[PDB]
Amino acid sequence: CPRFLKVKNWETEVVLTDTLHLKSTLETGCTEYICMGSIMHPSDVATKDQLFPLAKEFIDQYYSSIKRFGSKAHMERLEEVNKEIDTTSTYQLKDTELIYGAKHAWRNASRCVGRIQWSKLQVFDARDCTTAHGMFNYICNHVKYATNKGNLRSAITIFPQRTDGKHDFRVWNSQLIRYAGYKQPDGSTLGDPANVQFTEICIQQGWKPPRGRFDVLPLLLQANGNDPELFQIPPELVLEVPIRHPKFEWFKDLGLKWYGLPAVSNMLLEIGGLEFSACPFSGWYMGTEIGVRDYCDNSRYNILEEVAKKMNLDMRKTSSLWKDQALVEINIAVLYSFQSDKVTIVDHHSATESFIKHMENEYRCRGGCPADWVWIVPPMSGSITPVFHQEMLNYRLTPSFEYQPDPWNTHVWK
Amino acid sequence: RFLKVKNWETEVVLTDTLHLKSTLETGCTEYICMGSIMHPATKDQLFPLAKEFIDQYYSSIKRFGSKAHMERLEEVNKEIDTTSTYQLKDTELIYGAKHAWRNASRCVGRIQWSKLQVFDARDCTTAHGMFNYICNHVKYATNKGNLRSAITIFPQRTDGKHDFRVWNSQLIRYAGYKQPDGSTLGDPANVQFTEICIQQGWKPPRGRFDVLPLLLQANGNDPELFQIPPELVLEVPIRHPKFEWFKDLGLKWYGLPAVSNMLLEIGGLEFSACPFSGWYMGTEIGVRDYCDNSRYNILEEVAKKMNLDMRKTSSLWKDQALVEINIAVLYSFQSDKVTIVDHHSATESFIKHMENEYRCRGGCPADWVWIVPPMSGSITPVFHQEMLNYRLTPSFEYQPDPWNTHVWK
């Protein structure tokens, strides 16, 4: 690979120079002859010999970041890590290194448009947790802290790392807060279609479903490789926003609402070769995640048609753009409702503008900023946002957030 | 290896084998994806490229390894020997132009690829001849509003000192002028080309929608200016089905999109002048041409007449005015019976096209970054369709702007 790679912004003419790609760690899935940039997921534990260089790489990075590279504390930390891998096949991160690694997994997340915030992350160390009840306690505290009565604060809670792969900690939920989905005998779906499979697991595990349109799912929590256990989030911890429109008084009659806190909980955090299989993290929403995807995806709540009816649009011709018109109004209502209730939210114009400033800053201070254009560009109004015209380079740095298989597909039931 | 692509809305899975035939590079490596980067012969290089192309031609007409196939290869080898190049047969030229379109990973319109009128202009020698061929193309492709896809292919590159080039980036485009106070009148995308035309002797009317002259270069000579006969230039006034003030904005656009600055590669031969045209997808005009900050940039004016609150981004005033502008464009072309396709219909056709190509061809190279429309992305079916991008030949390629290379004789 060449030392310098340039990217151009075709709207402003600004050219930026990337050297950080030289530190890329993993395969992207692409080759010289095929690009897999639109593949959702392109791309048993580590041996002693695999772990040694991965830890040294991270430790070196850490001591370089605190401007102590080659120092006595650096060499002593290396040697202590090396002995621990020798005599235990693993090692333990210091609290400082845990915090640094979690912030940089966020900093490195190429699909995240919100990374201008990466250094303001509250890290909850939950590595002393031993049971699913204790996981529940840690998650409730996380939810309450991050919600902050609507003044949301980004946070991650980190449970014990993988050991032999048979004692994994896992949150079986895909997000800490999501709405149940129920397939009906007639083929229709009540609630959120995206969550039908997980809802069925919960019901089989013992959950009694209220069977409504917006039922908060219980937590299904797995500690130390044991069978997962069910817990109800205290509903006073779940901040929700009813959706209304500043002009259309009838919009509230749709009975729509959504929850304030997006808290993805099924990803794996990799730091220094260590694998944190339970690491729920939360920020705040960009409006289009709710208004475009959650509400208007055909396989989600799919409300475009009903909203267009109440708007009395012609729905016979696609070229009337009735779908685009209703989509805008739905997203206006979502932003209006969160702002009115003083729940943190960012519109897609503000967020993408901030991301561009962030990316420019990262290129100049760090030598680059891996970014996945396919994910960064918002799902509506793409070209009237600045990221659309911004060339990006995508590559994988560590520490990193990784996908992992769903736990019900791999779990060995006791 | 067989690669799978999934549609996450319908759960359909397709299996790609066609990527195994590509030879040109994408720009990506195993460690870095350049998917969003806009732009990532001799006797010895030429014969394998020619042989590959002749081989796929005769395989396409189900005569692979035939007597005609065998003799064509020897004819081509003998010719590259004695002239350092070769000439395509007419059948080969047509097959290669259609497949350059079929292989254009960035084009959502490719369900039409085999409906392409190919105009062979390889006998052309002067810019006057180029202008004649191009007028015929514009007249044929416009067809009084019932647009017909077409390409006109001028003589191929020889030594690189005798290139045929259309200096225009499209056959029909509007001029752009730098203003004294600092702003831009007309289309800012064409400011530089407009100045070259003025410097070359074009008298500019200095309006907002002045159709540019043709600047045409034959056999490496200085380019020459020509005016397209105005009766050949079909235009649409833009009005809105509900907002009667919209027509008062004075907006119009041309009906015929005809890209003229790309290079067509067939069997190792380079056709540096090959203008090709189809018909518009509404968002090309209504989103990019009208609403790019560095194009006509009209969102402010429209939202002002819509009386929207423009004080905060989260009112989505830009998004509202964007939809209304794209309604007007589609409504205007349709009312005037000028062919146009909306982005919902176009992307639906492309998903169908992908299914066809995977069935009959083993795949379809497709550039998600370009295929997904510039508005309303995820409510179109391509947003949820995984695509594999790879480079097949014959192909359309980018080439340098002629004024950056031309030694003015």
Ligand code: HEM
């Ligand atoms: C603070 C405000 C934040 C905003 C506005 C934000 C915004 C976004 C958005 C819009 C996406 C695309 C999600 C989708 O389409 O489903 C995303 C993805 C992502 N975000 Fe951020 N995010 C924020 C905080 C965070 C935090 C705190 C973390 C981790 C520490 C994080 C890590 C990620 C990751 C890993 C992805 C990719 C997820 C995947 O591939 O499934 N984000 N973010």
Ligand code: HEM
């Ligand atoms: C017939 C109707 C057609 C439609 C609706 C259509 C649609 C489109 C659209 C929307 C784009 C994106 C262009 C941009 O954003 O600037 C595009 C690109 C492209 N089209 Fe098609 N197209 C059509 C016909 C054709 C024909 C006839 C050819 C060639 C014979 C062709 C070759 C290409 C190529 C090479 C590109 C990529 C341009 C680039 O890389 O800059 N298209 N098309």
Ligand SMILES: Cc1cc(N)nc2cc(-c3ccc(OCc4ccc(C#N)cc4)c(CN)c3)ccc12
């Ligand atoms: C920290 C934070 C803040 C914020 N504001 N937003 C976030 C959004 C995500 C995020 C990414 C992909 C997802 O998933 C994509 C997907 C789509 C379809 C299928 C299917 N079938 C499977 C996955 C989902 C959904 N939980 C969330 C993650 C973290 C966020």
Ligand SMILES: Cc1cc(N)nc2cc(-c3ccc(OCc4ccc(C#N)cc4)c(CN)c3)ccc12
């Ligand atoms: C056959 C056909 C039909 C149709 N319906 N549509 C088309 C649209 C294009 C097309 C692609 C890229 C472009 O170029 C984008 C660009 C952006 C920034 C810079 C810069 N700086 C330079 C070029 C331009 C512009 N003529 C047109 C090509 C063929 C089309």
Ligand SMILES: C[C@H](O)[C@H](O)[C@H]1CNc2nc(N)[nH]c(=O)c2N1
């Ligand atoms: C097929 C395609 O890669 C897939 O639909 C992606 C596209 N880009 C996305 N971008 C974001 N932010 N979130 C998504 O879920 C997706 N889905």
Ligand SMILES: C[C@H](O)[C@H](O)[C@H]1CNc2nc(N)[nH]c(=O)c2N1
């Ligand atoms: C930087 C980015 O690649 C560039 O803006 C691309 C993005 N996608 C596009 N898609 C289409 N159809 N046309 C374009 O000009 C672009 N521009």
Ligand SMILES: [Zn+2]
């Ligand atoms: Zn790639």
